[PDB]
Scaffold this active site. Structure first.
Site, PDB file in Angstrom:
ATOM      1  N   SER A 132      -7.726 -15.166  -8.639  1.00 38.17           N
ATOM      2  CA  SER A 132      -7.059 -16.321  -8.078  1.00 38.17           C
ATOM      3  C   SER A 132      -7.685 -17.594  -8.623  1.00 38.17           C
ATOM      4  O   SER A 132      -8.878 -17.639  -8.921  1.00 38.17           O
ATOM      5  CB  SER A 132      -7.150 -16.267  -6.555  1.00 38.17           C
ATOM      6  OG  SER A 132      -6.696 -17.456  -5.936  1.00 38.17           O
TER       7      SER A 132
ATOM      8  N   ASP B  30      -0.905   2.458  -0.120  1.00 40.24           N
ATOM      9  CA  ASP B  30      -2.206   1.824  -0.269  1.00 40.24           C
ATOM     10  C   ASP B  30      -2.480   1.516  -1.737  1.00 40.24           C
ATOM     11  O   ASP B  30      -2.888   2.397  -2.488  1.00 40.24           O
ATOM     12  CB  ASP B  30      -3.286   2.752   0.287  1.00 40.24           C
ATOM     13  CG  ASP B  30      -4.672   2.161   0.184  1.00 40.24           C
ATOM     14  OD1 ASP B  30      -4.773   0.951  -0.079  1.00 40.24           O
ATOM     15  OD2 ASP B  30      -5.653   2.912   0.388  1.00 40.24           O
TER      16      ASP B  30
END
EC number: 3.4.23.22
Length: 330
Positions: A199, A35
């Site tokens: 992004s 994770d």
């Protein structure tokens, strides 16, 4: 040193991925959920409340000659999906894919929430976010990666998740045969303890690319892609009959649909998520309403590039003094 381990979807939807991890002496192999959005290595154990164990493999520290109680240390964690676990702490030898760390904090669960009990395939979590998020008190502990880093050939790990197929986590090296083209690296903020990056935009299907900054986290422990409501609405508007259902808890679409792809920007590069990756199947057995793999982050407080996005790429988690993230197509 290096390590290399195969990671395998837990079910036919790629809801999560499990990777075998050797703990203790002699080794006890547990299948852990790696994770990159958390920083605790915790396991089902001989200490876990018996009614809360249902099929998991447990770690038994009393059977490990290298286990030592970390006296006075406790831990307690809550995840974004509302699940939780807590307990006490041992140090022991932990190996992943041939890479060994001695003195790793292994957090033994005394209690786990129902979601964990109900998932027989996940024996615990191995956190790979920054150690500043580790929950052990009163002495915070380091992640497996942080402990291994100095010994690694290069201070990196890579995630190469499969779509409906096994993939690989590598430690200490970049497998140049595992991706196509070049890797594009992008800046990381560690301010919130995550692999947080920005992004450069998105496209829906064959549509034009929208240049826009989307801050979010690379999180292997989250199944879906969670993005701003504007972006998500633009995606689902291209699917006839798709709608947001408050009763179901997100966007659903007719199972008869063919889904468009979704592209996200990494600098000037582009990662394409095929439409099929965005199908999470019937909302309930036999239903013709299917659950979407792109969902709104509104009210999460952060955008999450979960498995839906990451499995479309070869992803480098660069833990050099100034961390960065790399993405390549594959």
């Amino acid at each position: 040193s290096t390590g290399s381990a195969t990671t395998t979807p837990i079910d036919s939807l790629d809801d999560a991925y499990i990777t075998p991890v050797q703990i203790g002496t002699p080794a006890q192999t547990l299948n852990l959920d790696f994770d990159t959005g958390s920083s605790d290595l915790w396991v089902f154990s001989s200490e876990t409340t018996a009614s809360e164990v249902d099929g998991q493999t447990i770690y038994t520290p009393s059977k490990s000659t290298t286990a030592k109680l970390l006296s006075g240390a406790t831990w307690s964690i809550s995840y974004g999906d509302g699940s939780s676990s807590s307990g006490d702490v041992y140090t022991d030898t932990v190996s992943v894919g041939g890479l060994t760390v001695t003195g790793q904090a292994v957090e033994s669960a005394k209690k786990v929430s129902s979601s964990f009990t109900e998932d027989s395939t996940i024996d615990g979590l191995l956190g790979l976010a920054f150690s500043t998020l580790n929950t052990v008190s009163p002495t915070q502990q380091k992640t497996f990666f942080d402990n291994a880093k100095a010994s690694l050939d290069s201070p990196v790990f890579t995630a190469d998740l499969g779509y409906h197929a096994p993939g690989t986590y590598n430690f200490g090296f970049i497998d140049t045969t595992a991706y196509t083209g070049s890797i594009t690296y992008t800046a990381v903020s560690t301010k919130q303890g995550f692999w947080e990056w920005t992004s450069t935009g998105y496209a829906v299907g064959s549509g034009t690319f929208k240049s826009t900054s989307i801050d979010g986290i690379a999180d292997t422990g989250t199944t879906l892609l969670y993005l701003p409501a504007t972006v998500v609405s633009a995606y689902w508007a291209q699917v006839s009959g798709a709608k947001s259902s408050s009763s179901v808890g997100g966007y659903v679409f007719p199972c008869s649909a063919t889904l468009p792809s979704f592209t996200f920007g990494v600098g000037s590069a582009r990662i394409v998520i095929p439409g099929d990756y965005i199908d999470f199947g019937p909302i309930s057995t036999g239903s013709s309403s299917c659950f979407g793999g792109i969902q709104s982050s509104a009210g999460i407080g952060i955008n999450i590039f979960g498995d839906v996005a990451l499995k479309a790429a070869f992803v480098v988690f660069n833990g050099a003094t100034t961390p960065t993230l790399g993405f390549a197509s594959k």
